[PDB]
Motif scaffolding. Sequence first.
Motif, PDB file in Angstrom:
ATOM      1  N   UNK A  33       0.818  -1.211   0.000  1.00  0.00           N
ATOM      2  CA  UNK A  33       0.000   0.000   0.000  1.00  0.00           C
ATOM      3  C   UNK A  33       0.856   1.267   0.000  1.00  0.00           C
ATOM      4  N   UNK A  34       1.797   1.345   0.938  1.00  0.00           N
ATOM      5  CA  UNK A  34       2.669   2.512   1.055  1.00  0.00           C
ATOM      6  C   UNK A  34       3.594   2.716  -0.143  1.00  0.00           C
ATOM      7  N   UNK A  35       3.966   1.632  -0.812  1.00  0.00           N
ATOM      8  CA  UNK A  35       4.847   1.740  -1.969  1.00  0.00           C
ATOM      9  C   UNK A  35       4.078   2.105  -3.233  1.00  0.00           C
ATOM     10  N   UNK A  36       2.888   1.534  -3.387  1.00  0.00           N
ATOM     11  CA  UNK A  36       2.057   1.791  -4.557  1.00  0.00           C
ATOM     12  C   UNK A  36       1.315   3.122  -4.498  1.00  0.00           C
ATOM     13  N   UNK A  37       0.947   3.545  -3.291  1.00  0.00           N
ATOM     14  CA  UNK A  37       0.220   4.794  -3.092  1.00  0.00           C
ATOM     15  C   UNK A  37       0.797   5.546  -1.898  1.00  0.00           C
ATOM     16  N   UNK A  38       1.998   6.129  -2.063  1.00  0.00           N
ATOM     17  CA  UNK A  38       2.724   6.889  -1.039  1.00  0.00           C
ATOM     18  C   UNK A  38       1.902   7.920  -0.269  1.00  0.00           C
ATOM     19  N   UNK A  39       0.908   8.504  -0.929  1.00  0.00           N
ATOM     20  CA  UNK A  39       0.075   9.512  -0.282  1.00  0.00           C
ATOM     21  C   UNK A  39      -0.641   8.951   0.946  1.00  0.00           C
ATOM     22  N   UNK A  40      -0.939   7.654   0.930  1.00  0.00           N
ATOM     23  CA  UNK A  40      -1.631   7.041   2.059  1.00  0.00           C
ATOM     24  C   UNK A  40      -0.766   7.043   3.314  1.00  0.00           C
ATOM     25  N   UNK A  41       0.552   7.002   3.134  1.00  0.00           N
ATOM     26  CA  UNK A  41       1.464   6.999   4.273  1.00  0.00           C
ATOM     27  C   UNK A  41       1.335   8.287   5.081  1.00  0.00           C
ATOM     28  N   UNK A  42       1.007   9.383   4.405  1.00  0.00           N
ATOM     29  CA  UNK A  42       0.858  10.666   5.080  1.00  0.00           C
ATOM     30  C   UNK A  42      -0.300  10.707   6.067  1.00  0.00           C
ATOM     31  N   UNK A  43      -1.169   9.702   6.020  1.00  0.00           N
ATOM     32  CA  UNK A  43      -2.306   9.653   6.932  1.00  0.00           C
ATOM     33  C   UNK A  43      -1.940   9.064   8.292  1.00  0.00           C
ATOM     34  N   UNK A  44      -0.781   8.414   8.379  1.00  0.00           N
ATOM     35  CA  UNK A  44      -0.333   7.801   9.629  1.00  0.00           C
ATOM     36  C   UNK A  44       0.796   8.589  10.293  1.00  0.00           C
ATOM     37  N   UNK A  45       0.465   9.407  11.285  1.00  0.00           N
ATOM     38  CA  UNK A  45       1.488  10.189  11.978  1.00  0.00           C
ATOM     39  C   UNK A  45       2.559   9.283  12.585  1.00  0.00           C
ATOM     40  N   UNK A  46       2.155   8.094  13.018  1.00  0.00           N
ATOM     41  CA  UNK A  46       3.083   7.145  13.629  1.00  0.00           C
ATOM     42  C   UNK A  46       4.077   6.526  12.651  1.00  0.00           C
ATOM     43  N   UNK A  47       3.733   6.493  11.366  1.00  0.00           N
ATOM     44  CA  UNK A  47       4.612   5.866  10.378  1.00  0.00           C
ATOM     45  C   UNK A  47       5.091   6.737   9.220  1.00  0.00           C
ATOM     46  N   UNK A  48       4.592   7.963   9.114  1.00  0.00           N
ATOM     47  CA  UNK A  48       4.978   8.813   7.994  1.00  0.00           C
ATOM     48  C   UNK A  48       6.466   9.126   7.863  1.00  0.00           C
ATOM     49  N   UNK A  49       7.259   8.774   8.868  1.00  0.00           N
ATOM     50  CA  UNK A  49       8.694   9.036   8.814  1.00  0.00           C
ATOM     51  C   UNK A  49       9.453   7.920   8.092  1.00  0.00           C
ATOM     52  N   UNK A  50       8.836   6.747   7.982  1.00  0.00           N
ATOM     53  CA  UNK A  50       9.474   5.609   7.323  1.00  0.00           C
ATOM     54  C   UNK A  50       9.850   5.966   5.887  1.00  0.00           C
ATOM     55  N   UNK A  51      11.135   5.822   5.568  1.00  0.00           N
ATOM     56  CA  UNK A  51      11.650   6.165   4.244  1.00  0.00           C
ATOM     57  C   UNK A  51      11.784   5.012   3.251  1.00  0.00           C
ATOM     58  N   UNK A  52      12.162   3.837   3.739  1.00  0.00           N
ATOM     59  CA  UNK A  52      12.369   2.690   2.865  1.00  0.00           C
ATOM     60  C   UNK A  52      11.586   1.447   3.268  1.00  0.00           C
ATOM     61  N   UNK A  53      11.527   0.481   2.356  1.00  0.00           N
ATOM     62  CA  UNK A  53      10.829  -0.771   2.615  1.00  0.00           C
ATOM     63  C   UNK A  53      11.535  -1.477   3.759  1.00  0.00           C
ATOM     64  N   UNK A  54      12.854  -1.323   3.795  1.00  0.00           N
ATOM     65  CA  UNK A  54      13.666  -1.936   4.832  1.00  0.00           C
ATOM     66  C   UNK A  54      13.244  -1.408   6.196  1.00  0.00           C
ATOM     67  N   UNK A  55      12.983  -0.107   6.271  1.00  0.00           N
ATOM     68  CA  UNK A  55      12.564   0.512   7.527  1.00  0.00           C
ATOM     69  C   UNK A  55      11.162   0.047   7.910  1.00  0.00           C
ATOM     70  N   UNK A  56      10.309  -0.132   6.910  1.00  0.00           N
ATOM     71  CA  UNK A  56       8.946  -0.595   7.145  1.00  0.00           C
ATOM     72  C   UNK A  56       8.952  -2.026   7.683  1.00  0.00           C
ATOM     73  N   UNK A  57       9.749  -2.894   7.069  1.00  0.00           N
ATOM     74  CA  UNK A  57       9.824  -4.283   7.514  1.00  0.00           C
ATOM     75  C   UNK A  57      10.365  -4.397   8.932  1.00  0.00           C
ATOM     76  N   UNK A  58      11.253  -3.479   9.300  1.00  0.00           N
ATOM     77  CA  UNK A  58      11.867  -3.490  10.625  1.00  0.00           C
ATOM     78  C   UNK A  58      11.008  -2.876  11.728  1.00  0.00           C
ATOM     79  N   UNK A  59       9.977  -2.125  11.351  1.00  0.00           N
ATOM     80  CA  UNK A  59       9.121  -1.485  12.340  1.00  0.00           C
ATOM     81  C   UNK A  59       8.238  -2.456  13.112  1.00  0.00           C
TER      82      UNK A  59
END
Length: 154
Positions: A33-59
């Motif tokens: 979701x976050x990779x295909x539609x980046x705008x959706x990431x902006x809706x999550x204050x808790x996760x909007x800082x995640x920059x890469x897939x690697x960071x997402x997998x590690x969260x």
Amino acid sequence: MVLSEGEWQLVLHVWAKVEADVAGHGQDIFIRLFKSHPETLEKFDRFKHLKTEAEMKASEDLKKHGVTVLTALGAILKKKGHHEAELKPLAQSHATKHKIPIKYLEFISEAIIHVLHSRHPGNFGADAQGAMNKALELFRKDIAAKYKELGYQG
Ligand code: HEM
């Protein structure tokens, strides 16, 4: 709209596979979701800082969130259409607190279908995907109806 018992059986059969590893499926879905539609990431204050897939997998927090979301979606699917009670609080939080447009619900539905297609091709053929799409469209249709009653057009 109404699904037949046969369509619900196809939906619940593949979902049973998903439940074998909820956390894993949750991660794939949100990363997609976050990779295909980046705008959706902006809706999550808790996760909007995640920059890469690697960071997402590690969260750890993202993985826990994915389990919470899939568990709620699973509860709804198992009601086989009789989900009025489960939808109420969900519709209120997403329309009033999070402010999520129906459009974004379509995006996550696409992510779900994509992940199921990738992970369970043997249990997600054309007919099964059609059944899952129908169940998700019903979900979105009913959530949309609640949005209006609650005063949110989005
Ligand atoms: C399959 C549809 C979805 C389901 C079943 C679902 C379910 C949930 C659940 C159970 C929670 C926690 C309780 C709550 O706040 O109500 C939650 C939180 C949240 N959802 Fe959803 N959600 C869905 C789609 C979305 C979409 C597409 C977005 C927007 C991209 C979204 C954004 C949020 C946000 C921002 C939170 C709060 C996260 C936090 O700060 O902890 N949800 N969702």
